[PDB]
């Protein structure tokens, strides 16, 4: 019953998550993932005391925009993928089918240059490097878009403030005109009779 929270604000703390995610249920502990140097990793893991609480948190934070700071950046929540590095898989869990032995035809050894192994694994490593450059390109694209949005925060906020105050100013003026005209109508009607 654990979920991962991404896109954390710049300054967050362990207790902030558990007091922010408590409105969906009784969280057990809320950890903000941190590296060796001590800076936040930008990812956090929260586990709930029950599956329905997790479902409610997931649905509500996915459909809505769960801000947890003055900084208007909603957090993205996804199920926490249980990955274990204690078991892995020993020999006994391997089915040991015909695929097992066909896959075990040579020991763990390097490929001699000039053999078919070498020119095929070189294609494989070229594919891996192309994967890495594609992922880096996507990461840099997202970083550029995010930095562009962060700069446009103040201008959008100020324009929204201007729009809101012009709107309610117009509604105040309409209220004034309506009150004045109804008062004039009613005084004329009362003096007519």
């Amino acid at each position: 019953a654990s979920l991962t929270v991404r896109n954390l604000p710049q300054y967050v703390s362990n207790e902030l998550l558990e007091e922010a995610f408590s409105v969906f249920g009784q969280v057990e502990r809320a950890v903000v993932i941190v590296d060796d140097r001590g800076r936040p990793s930008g990812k956090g893991i929260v586990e709930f005391s029950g599956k329905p609480a997790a479902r409610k948190a997931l649905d509500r934070c996915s459909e809505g925009s769960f801000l947890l700071t003055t900084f208007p950046r909603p957090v993205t929540v996804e199920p926490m993928d249980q990955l274990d590095d204690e078991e892995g898989l020993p020999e006994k869990l391997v089915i040991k089918n015909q695929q097992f032995h066909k896959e075990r035809e040579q020991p763990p050894r390097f490929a001699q240059p000039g053999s078919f192994e070498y020119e095929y694994a070189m294609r494989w490593k070229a594919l891996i490097e192309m994967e890495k450059q594609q992922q880096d390109q996507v990461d840099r694209n997202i970083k550029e878009a995010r930095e562009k949005l962060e700069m446009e925060m103040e201008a959008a906020r100020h324009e929204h403030q201007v729009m809101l105050m012009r709107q309610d100013l117009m509604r105040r003026q309409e209220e004034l005109r309506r009150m004045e005209e109804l008062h004039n109508q009613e005084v004329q009607k009362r003096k007519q009779l």
Binding site: I33, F66, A111, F116, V138
Partner: protein, 178 residues
């Protein structure tokens, strides 16, 4: 002295992964990463009893090519990033920042329709969705390239054998002519 490993066929297990890097030195524990279902995620972690063995393993597999299984799929090693999942960022270091307090003056909310925060969170959500689409496209491209390489198992080997035989015949003809 921990090295992070991926690009491994599922069938390689803990004992082969620990046997393979044994040539690099002592291996106390080399464990692969597996999801709940038991299927291997293709990522493995190797921890070394000594630092120099771990560094020279990376040095050797940086330029060389290393194979575990009959299928010629190389093994990629890189230094393993240390992440903490039990001790996050405490309040003490949190408040050393002077503007951490004034950043928290607004409680965790859900925004309100028509307010600026809701108007901007929509843009942020659109950015997140487009990021998800781009990542999914990259993963699909990778899946298709995986399939294309796996289909070319037999053709490449057959062509290589035919080419070796053809140069053998050509050199035999050249010797016979002389």
């Amino acid at each position: 002295a921990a090295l992070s490993v991926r690009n491994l066929s599922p069938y390689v297990s803990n004992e082969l992964l620990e046997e393979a890097f044994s040539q690099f030195g002592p291996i106390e524990r080399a464990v692969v990463i597996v999801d709940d279902r038991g299927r291997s995620t293709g990522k493995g972690i190797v921890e070394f009893a000594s630092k120099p063995a771990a560094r020279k393993a990376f040095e050797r597999c940086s330029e060389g090519v290393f194979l575990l299984t009959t299928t010629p799929r190389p093994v990629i090693v890189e230094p393993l990033e240390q992440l903490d999942d039990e001790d996050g960022l405490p309040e003490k270091l949190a408040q050393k920042n002077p503007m951490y307090q004034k950043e928290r003056e607004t409680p965790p909310r859900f925004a309100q329709h028509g307010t600026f925060e809701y108007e901007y969170s929509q843009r942020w959500k659109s950015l997140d969705e487009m990021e998800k689409q781009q990542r999914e496209q990259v993963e699909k491209n990778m899946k298709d390239a995986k399939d294309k390489l796996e289909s070319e198992m037999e053709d490449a080997y057959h062509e290589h054998q035919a080419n070796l035989l053809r140069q053998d015949l050509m050199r035999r003809q050249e010797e016979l002519r002389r």
